[PDB]
Design a protein around this ligand. Structure first.
Ligand code: GSH
Ligand code: GSH
Lengths: 202, 202
C-alpha cells in the first residue's frame, strides 16, 4: 500500500512533506483539521493518530509512524543513494540526531506558548527572547557551512526550514540572522521544497 | 581517554547515567552547577558545552555529544549484546526513536515551565493538564507489556524513568497511573538504576 502523510498546511508536517519529495518515494497526502480532528475526507483523526497531531505517516505495511524526527529518519534511510542523512554507525549520524533533537525540543516546542491564545503577552515576550538566542545561535552555525550539518542539504534542513518559517510569520526578532536569511533563501529554491509548499497551497 | 558524563543530580542526565551502567561500559562522571556554569573541578562549562546544559558526554576521541536522545542511542549501539535498543534500519528502531522524541518533546520539555518561576500560574495549569493526559497515555501503553517498547528494558525506559521522577517530585496529577506506578517500582529495582541514583546521592 502507498505511503500517506497526514499534514496541515504550514505546520511541522511540512518537514517530512519536503523529505518525501526529496526522497523520490511514492506517497499521497491527506489534510487534517487540527481543531475538529477530522481529515479532509471526513475521517476521525483520533482513530488514526491517538495523539491527535501531525505529522503522522502510514507506512507501506499499513502501520503508523508518528514524531517528525522519527519520520524523516525513516524516509532518509529508505533512500541511501540520495544521502539525505549520514549513514547509521557514523559519528555524523549521531550529530544529525543531536540537531534533530535540538530543533524538535528547543525550536519547535519553543514556539508552543506563542500559538496558544490563552498565553499572557508578558510570558510571550520572555518566550520570544529565548527563541531570539536560539535562532541567533543557529545563525552562528550557518556561518561556518552552507547547511545545518555541513556542506550538503539534509533532513535536518527540512525541519529547520519548516520551523524558521514560523519565526518569519510571527515577526520574531533575531539578533544574528544574516546567514539564516541567506540559508532560508537557498533552501526555498529547491524544487522539492517548492513542490511541497505548492501542494499545501502556500 | 575513557568516556566522561557531565551531569546534575536527578536532572535529565540521569537517563544516560543509567544507560552507561546498563551497558557495562567503563566511564567516569563529573557534576555541573547549572547557574554558575562551573563544573565541580573549576572549568568553564560553556567552553565544554556552549548550550550550557546537561547531559554532555565526552567520547574517546575527545569530542562532545549533547542531547540525551543522541547520547543514549550512541551508547546502546555500542553494546549490541546488551540489546538496549533495536538495531538501526529496523522498524523497531524507528519506534524507539519515536518514543524517545515523544519523551524529549512532550514530557521533558513539558516540565520546563513548571520549574521556572517566570511562568505565569495559569500557563502552569494548562501545562499540568497536558502532562496529565500525556502520562495517562503512557500509562495505557504500559498496560500492554513490562516496559515502554515491549517486554525488554531499553534506553527509552531510562529516559521515561528519569522524567517520571519529576512528576512524582511535583506530585503531578495523573488520571491513569496504576500501570505507570508499577513500572516505576520495577525500574527502580534494577541494579544499574540503583547505582546511578546512589552515585548521584539520591
Ligand atoms: N512531538 C510531536 C509534536 C508534533 C506537533 O506539535 N504537531 C502540531 C502541529 S505543529 C500539532 O499537530 N498540534 C495539534 C495538537 O497538538 O492538538 C512531533 O515532534 O512530531
Ligand atoms: N535539548 C536538551 C535539553 C537538555 C536540558 O534541558 N538539560 C537541563 C537539565 S534537565 C539543563 O541542563 N538546564 C540548564 C540550562 O538550561 O541552562 C536535551 O534534550 O538534551
Amino acid at each position: 500500500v502507498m505511503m500517506k502523510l497526514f499534514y496541515k498546511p504550514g505546520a511541522c508536517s511540512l518537514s517530512p512533506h519536503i523529505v518525501l519529495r526529496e526522497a523520490g518515494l511514492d506517497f499521497s497526502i491527506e489534510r487534517v483539521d487540527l481543531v475538529t480532528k477530522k481529515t479532509e475526507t471526513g475521517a476521525d483523526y483520533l482513530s488514526i493518530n491517538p495523539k491527535g497531531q501531525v505529522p503522522a505517516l502510514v507506512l507501506d505495511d499499513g502501520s503508523l509512524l508518528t514524531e517528525g524526527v522519527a519520520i524523516v529518519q525513516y524516509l532518509a534511510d529508505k533512500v541511501p543513494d540520495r544521502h539525505l542523512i549520514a549513514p547509521s554507525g557514523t559519528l555524523s549520524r549521531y550529530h544529525a540526531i543531536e540537531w534533530l533533537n535540538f530543533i524538535a525540543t528547543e525550536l519547535h516546542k519553543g514556539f508552543s506558548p506563542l500559538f496558544n491564545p490563552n498565553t499572557p503577552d508578558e510570558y510571550k515576550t520572555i518566550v520570544r527572547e529565548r527563541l531570539d538566542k536560539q535562532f541567533s545561535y543557529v545563525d552562528s552555525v550557518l556561518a561556518e557551512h552552507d547547511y545545518l550539518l555541513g556542506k550538503k542539504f539534509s533532513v535536518a534542513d527540512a525541519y529547520l526550514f519548516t520551523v524558521s518559517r514560523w519565526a518569519n510569520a510571527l515577526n520574531l526578532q533575531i539578533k544574528e540572522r544574516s546567514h539564516l536569511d541567506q540559508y532560508m533563501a537557498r533552501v526555498a529554491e529547491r524544487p522539492a521544497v517548492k513542490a511541497a509548499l505548492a501542494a499545501e497551497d502556500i
